[PDB]
PDBML (XML) file of the C-alpha atoms, coordinates in Angstrom:
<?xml version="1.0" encoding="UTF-8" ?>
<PDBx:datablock datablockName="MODEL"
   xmlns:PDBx="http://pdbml.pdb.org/schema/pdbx-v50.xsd"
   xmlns:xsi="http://www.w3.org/2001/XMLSchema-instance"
   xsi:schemaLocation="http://pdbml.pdb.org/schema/pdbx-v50.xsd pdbx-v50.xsd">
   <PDBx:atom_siteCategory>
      <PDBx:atom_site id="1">
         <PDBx:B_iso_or_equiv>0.00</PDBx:B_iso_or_equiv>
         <PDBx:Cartn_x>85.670</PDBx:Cartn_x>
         <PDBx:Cartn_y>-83.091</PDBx:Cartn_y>
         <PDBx:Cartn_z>58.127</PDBx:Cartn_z>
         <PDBx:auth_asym_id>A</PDBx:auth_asym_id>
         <PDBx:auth_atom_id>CA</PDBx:auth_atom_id>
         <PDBx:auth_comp_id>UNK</PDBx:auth_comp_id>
         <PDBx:auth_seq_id>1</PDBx:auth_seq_id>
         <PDBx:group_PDB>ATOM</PDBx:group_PDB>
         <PDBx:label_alt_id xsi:nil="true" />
         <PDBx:label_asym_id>A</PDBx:label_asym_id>
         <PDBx:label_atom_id>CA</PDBx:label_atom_id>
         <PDBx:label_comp_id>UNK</PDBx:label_comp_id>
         <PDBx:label_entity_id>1</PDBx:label_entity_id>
         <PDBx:label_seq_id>1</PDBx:label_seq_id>
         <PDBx:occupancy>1.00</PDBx:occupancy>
         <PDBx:pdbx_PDB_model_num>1</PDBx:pdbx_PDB_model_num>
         <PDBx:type_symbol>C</PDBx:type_symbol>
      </PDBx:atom_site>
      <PDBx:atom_site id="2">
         <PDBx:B_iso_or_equiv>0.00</PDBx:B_iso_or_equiv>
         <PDBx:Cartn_x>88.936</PDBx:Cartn_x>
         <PDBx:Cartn_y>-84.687</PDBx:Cartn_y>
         <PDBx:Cartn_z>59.741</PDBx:Cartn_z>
         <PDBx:auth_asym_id>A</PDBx:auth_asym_id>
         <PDBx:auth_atom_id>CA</PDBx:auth_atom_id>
         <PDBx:auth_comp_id>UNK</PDBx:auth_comp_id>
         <PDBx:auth_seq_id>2</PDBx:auth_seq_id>
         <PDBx:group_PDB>ATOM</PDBx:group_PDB>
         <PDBx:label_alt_id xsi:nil="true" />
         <PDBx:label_asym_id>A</PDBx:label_asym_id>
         <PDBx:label_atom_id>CA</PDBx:label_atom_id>
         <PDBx:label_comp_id>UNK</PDBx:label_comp_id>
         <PDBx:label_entity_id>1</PDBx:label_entity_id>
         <PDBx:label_seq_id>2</PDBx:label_seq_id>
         <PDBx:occupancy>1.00</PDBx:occupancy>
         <PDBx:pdbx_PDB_model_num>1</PDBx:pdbx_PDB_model_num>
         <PDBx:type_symbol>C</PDBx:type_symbol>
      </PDBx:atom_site>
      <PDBx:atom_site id="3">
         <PDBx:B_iso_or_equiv>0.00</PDBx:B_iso_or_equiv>
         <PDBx:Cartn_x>91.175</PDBx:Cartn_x>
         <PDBx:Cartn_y>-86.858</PDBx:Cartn_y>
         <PDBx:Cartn_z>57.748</PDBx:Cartn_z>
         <PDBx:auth_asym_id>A</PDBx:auth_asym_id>
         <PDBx:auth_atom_id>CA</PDBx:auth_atom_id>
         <PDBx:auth_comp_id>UNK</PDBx:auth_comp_id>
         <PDBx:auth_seq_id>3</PDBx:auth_seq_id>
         <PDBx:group_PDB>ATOM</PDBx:group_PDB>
         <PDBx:label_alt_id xsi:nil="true" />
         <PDBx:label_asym_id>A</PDBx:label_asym_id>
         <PDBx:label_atom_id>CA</PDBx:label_atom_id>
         <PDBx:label_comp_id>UNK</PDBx:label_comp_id>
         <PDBx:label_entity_id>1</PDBx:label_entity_id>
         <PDBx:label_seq_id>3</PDBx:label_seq_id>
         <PDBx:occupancy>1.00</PDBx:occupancy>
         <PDBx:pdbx_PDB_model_num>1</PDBx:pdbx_PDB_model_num>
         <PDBx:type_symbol>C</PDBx:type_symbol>
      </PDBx:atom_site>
      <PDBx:atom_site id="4">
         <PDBx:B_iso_or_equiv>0.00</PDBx:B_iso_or_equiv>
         <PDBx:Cartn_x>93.136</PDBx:Cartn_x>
         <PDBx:Cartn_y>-89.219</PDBx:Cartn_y>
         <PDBx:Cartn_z>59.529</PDBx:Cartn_z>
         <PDBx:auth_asym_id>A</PDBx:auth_asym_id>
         <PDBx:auth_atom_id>CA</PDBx:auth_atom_id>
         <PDBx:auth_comp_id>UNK</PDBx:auth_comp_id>
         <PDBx:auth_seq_id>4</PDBx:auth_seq_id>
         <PDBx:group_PDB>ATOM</PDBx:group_PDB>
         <PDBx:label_alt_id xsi:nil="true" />
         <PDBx:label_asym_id>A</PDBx:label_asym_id>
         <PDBx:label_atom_id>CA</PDBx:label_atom_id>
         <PDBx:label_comp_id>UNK</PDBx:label_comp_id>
         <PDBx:label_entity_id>1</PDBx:label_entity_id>
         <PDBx:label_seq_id>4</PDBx:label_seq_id>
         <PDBx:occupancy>1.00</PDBx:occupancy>
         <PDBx:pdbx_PDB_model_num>1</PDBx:pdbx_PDB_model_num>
         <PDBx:type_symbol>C</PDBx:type_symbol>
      </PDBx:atom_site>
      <PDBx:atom_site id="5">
         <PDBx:B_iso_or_equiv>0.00</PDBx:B_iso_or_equiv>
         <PDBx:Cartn_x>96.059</PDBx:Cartn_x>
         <PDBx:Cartn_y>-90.559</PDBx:Cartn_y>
         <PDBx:Cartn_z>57.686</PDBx:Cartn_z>
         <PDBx:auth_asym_id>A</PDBx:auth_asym_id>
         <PDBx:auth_atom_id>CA</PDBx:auth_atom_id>
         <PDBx:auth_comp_id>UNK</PDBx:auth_comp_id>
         <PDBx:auth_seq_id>5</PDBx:auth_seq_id>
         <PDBx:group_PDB>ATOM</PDBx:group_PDB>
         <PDBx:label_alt_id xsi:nil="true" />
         <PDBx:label_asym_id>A</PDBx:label_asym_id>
         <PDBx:label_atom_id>CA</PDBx:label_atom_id>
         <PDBx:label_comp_id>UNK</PDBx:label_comp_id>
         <PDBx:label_entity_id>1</PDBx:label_entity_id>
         <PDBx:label_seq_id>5</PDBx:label_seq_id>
         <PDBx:occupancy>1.00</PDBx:occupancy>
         <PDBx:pdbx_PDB_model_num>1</PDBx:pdbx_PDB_model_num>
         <PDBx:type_symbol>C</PDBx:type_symbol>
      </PDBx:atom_site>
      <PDBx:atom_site id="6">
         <PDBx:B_iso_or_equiv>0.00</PDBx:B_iso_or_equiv>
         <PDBx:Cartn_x>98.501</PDBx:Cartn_x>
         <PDBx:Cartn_y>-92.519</PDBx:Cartn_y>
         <PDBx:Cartn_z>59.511</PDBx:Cartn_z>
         <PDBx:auth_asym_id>A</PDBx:auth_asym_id>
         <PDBx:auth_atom_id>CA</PDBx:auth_atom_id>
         <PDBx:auth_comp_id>UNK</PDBx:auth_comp_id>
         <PDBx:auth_seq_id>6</PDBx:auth_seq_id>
         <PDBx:group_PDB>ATOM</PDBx:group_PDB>
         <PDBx:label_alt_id xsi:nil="true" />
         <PDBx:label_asym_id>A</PDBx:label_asym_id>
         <PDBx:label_atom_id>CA</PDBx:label_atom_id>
         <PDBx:label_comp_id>UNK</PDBx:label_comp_id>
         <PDBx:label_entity_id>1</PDBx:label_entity_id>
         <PDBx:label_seq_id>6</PDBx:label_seq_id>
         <PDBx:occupancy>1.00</PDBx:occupancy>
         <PDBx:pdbx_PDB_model_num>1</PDBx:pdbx_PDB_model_num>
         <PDBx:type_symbol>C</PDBx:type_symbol>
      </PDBx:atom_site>
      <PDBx:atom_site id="7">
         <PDBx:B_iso_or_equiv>0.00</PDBx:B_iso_or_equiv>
         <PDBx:Cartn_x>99.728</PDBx:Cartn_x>
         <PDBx:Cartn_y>-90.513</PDBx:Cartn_y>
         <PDBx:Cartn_z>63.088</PDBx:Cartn_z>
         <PDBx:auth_asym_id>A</PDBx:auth_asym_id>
         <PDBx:auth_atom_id>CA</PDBx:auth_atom_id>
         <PDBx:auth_comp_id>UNK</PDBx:auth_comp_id>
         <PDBx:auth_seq_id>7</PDBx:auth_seq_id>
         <PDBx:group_PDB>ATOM</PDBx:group_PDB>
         <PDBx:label_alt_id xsi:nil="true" />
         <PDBx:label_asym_id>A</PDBx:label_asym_id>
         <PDBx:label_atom_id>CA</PDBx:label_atom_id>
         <PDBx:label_comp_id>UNK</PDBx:label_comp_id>
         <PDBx:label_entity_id>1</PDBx:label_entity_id>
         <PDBx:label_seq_id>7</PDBx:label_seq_id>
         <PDBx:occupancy>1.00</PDBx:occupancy>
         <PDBx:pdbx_PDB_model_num>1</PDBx:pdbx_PDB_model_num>
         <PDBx:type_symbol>C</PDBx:type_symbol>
      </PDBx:atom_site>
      <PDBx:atom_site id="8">
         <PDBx:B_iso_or_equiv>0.00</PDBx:B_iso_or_equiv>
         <PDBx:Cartn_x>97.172</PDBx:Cartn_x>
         <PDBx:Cartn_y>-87.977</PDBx:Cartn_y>
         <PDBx:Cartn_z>63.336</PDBx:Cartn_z>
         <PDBx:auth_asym_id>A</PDBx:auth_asym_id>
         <PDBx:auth_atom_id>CA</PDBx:auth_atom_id>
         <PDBx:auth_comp_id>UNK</PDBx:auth_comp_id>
         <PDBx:auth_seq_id>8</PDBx:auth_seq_id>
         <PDBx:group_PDB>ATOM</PDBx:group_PDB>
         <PDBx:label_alt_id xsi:nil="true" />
         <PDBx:label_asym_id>A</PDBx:label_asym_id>
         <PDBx:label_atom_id>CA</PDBx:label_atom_id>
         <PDBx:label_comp_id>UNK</PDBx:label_comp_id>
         <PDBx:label_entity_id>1</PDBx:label_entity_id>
         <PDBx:label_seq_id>8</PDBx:label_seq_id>
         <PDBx:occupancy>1.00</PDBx:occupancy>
         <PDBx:pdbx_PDB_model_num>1</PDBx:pdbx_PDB_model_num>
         <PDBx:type_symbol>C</PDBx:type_symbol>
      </PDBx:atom_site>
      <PDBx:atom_site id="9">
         <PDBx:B_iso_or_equiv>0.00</PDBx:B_iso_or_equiv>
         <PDBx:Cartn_x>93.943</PDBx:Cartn_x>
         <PDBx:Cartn_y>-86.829</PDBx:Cartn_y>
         <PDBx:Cartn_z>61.977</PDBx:Cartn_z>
         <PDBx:auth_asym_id>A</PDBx:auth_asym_id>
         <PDBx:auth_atom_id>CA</PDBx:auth_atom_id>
         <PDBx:auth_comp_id>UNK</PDBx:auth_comp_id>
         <PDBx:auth_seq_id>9</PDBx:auth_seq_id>
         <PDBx:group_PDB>ATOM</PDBx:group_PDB>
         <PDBx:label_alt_id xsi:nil="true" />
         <PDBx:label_asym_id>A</PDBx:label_asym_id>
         <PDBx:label_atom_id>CA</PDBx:label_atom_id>
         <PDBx:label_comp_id>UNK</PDBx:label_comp_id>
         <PDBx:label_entity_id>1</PDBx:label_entity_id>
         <PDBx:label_seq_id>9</PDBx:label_seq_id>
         <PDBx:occupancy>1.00</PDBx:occupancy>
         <PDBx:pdbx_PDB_model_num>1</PDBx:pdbx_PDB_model_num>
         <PDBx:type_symbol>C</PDBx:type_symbol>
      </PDBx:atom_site>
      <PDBx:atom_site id="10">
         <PDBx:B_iso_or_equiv>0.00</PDBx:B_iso_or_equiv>
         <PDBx:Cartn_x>94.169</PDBx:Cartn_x>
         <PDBx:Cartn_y>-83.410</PDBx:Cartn_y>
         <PDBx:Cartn_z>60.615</PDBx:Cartn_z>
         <PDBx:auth_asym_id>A</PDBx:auth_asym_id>
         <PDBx:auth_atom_id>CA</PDBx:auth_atom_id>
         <PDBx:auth_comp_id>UNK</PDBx:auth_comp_id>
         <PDBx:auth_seq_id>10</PDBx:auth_seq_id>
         <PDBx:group_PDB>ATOM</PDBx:group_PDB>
         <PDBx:label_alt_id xsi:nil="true" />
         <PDBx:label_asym_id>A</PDBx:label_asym_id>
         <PDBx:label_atom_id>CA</PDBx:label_atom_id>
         <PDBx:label_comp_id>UNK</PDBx:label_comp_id>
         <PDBx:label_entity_id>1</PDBx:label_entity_id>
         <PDBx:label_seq_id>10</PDBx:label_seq_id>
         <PDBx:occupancy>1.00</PDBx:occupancy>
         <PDBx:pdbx_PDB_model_num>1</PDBx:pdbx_PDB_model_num>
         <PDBx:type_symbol>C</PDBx:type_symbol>
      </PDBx:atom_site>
      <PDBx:atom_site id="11">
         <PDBx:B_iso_or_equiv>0.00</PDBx:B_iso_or_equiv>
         <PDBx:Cartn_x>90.973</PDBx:Cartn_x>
         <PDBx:Cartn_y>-80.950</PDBx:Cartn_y>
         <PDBx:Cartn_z>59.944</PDBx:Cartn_z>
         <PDBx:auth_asym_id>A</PDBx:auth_asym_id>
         <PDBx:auth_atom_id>CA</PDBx:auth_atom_id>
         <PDBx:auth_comp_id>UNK</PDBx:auth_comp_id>
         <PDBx:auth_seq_id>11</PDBx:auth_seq_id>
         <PDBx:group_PDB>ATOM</PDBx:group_PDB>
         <PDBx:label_alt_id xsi:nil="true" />
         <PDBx:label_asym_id>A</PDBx:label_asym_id>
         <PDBx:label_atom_id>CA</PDBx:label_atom_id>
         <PDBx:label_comp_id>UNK</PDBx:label_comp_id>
         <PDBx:label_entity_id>1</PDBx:label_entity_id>
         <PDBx:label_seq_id>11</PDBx:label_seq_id>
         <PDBx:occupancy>1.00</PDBx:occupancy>
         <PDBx:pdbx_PDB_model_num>1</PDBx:pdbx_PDB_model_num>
         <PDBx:type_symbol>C</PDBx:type_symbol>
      </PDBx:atom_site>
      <PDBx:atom_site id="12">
         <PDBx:B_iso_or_equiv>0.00</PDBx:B_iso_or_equiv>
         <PDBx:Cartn_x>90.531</PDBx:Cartn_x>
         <PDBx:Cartn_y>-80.991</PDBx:Cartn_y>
         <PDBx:Cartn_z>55.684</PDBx:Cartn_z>
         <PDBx:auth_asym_id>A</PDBx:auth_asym_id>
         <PDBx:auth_atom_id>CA</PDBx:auth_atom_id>
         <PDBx:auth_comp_id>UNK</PDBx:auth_comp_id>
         <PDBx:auth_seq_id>12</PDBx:auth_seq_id>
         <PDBx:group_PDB>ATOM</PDBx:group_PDB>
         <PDBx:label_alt_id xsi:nil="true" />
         <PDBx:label_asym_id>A</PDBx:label_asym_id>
         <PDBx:label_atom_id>CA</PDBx:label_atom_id>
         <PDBx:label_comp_id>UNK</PDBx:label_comp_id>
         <PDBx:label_entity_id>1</PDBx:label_entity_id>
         <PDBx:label_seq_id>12</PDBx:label_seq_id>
         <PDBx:occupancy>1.00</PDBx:occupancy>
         <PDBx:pdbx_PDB_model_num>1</PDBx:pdbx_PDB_model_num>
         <PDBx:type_symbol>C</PDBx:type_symbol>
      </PDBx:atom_site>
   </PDBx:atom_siteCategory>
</PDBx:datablock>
């Protein structure tokens, strides 16, 4: 479950 937002994609 990885949530990218704008720069990076961080593990949620």
């Amino acid at each position: 479950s990885t949530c990218c937002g704008y720069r990076m994609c961080v593990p949620c």
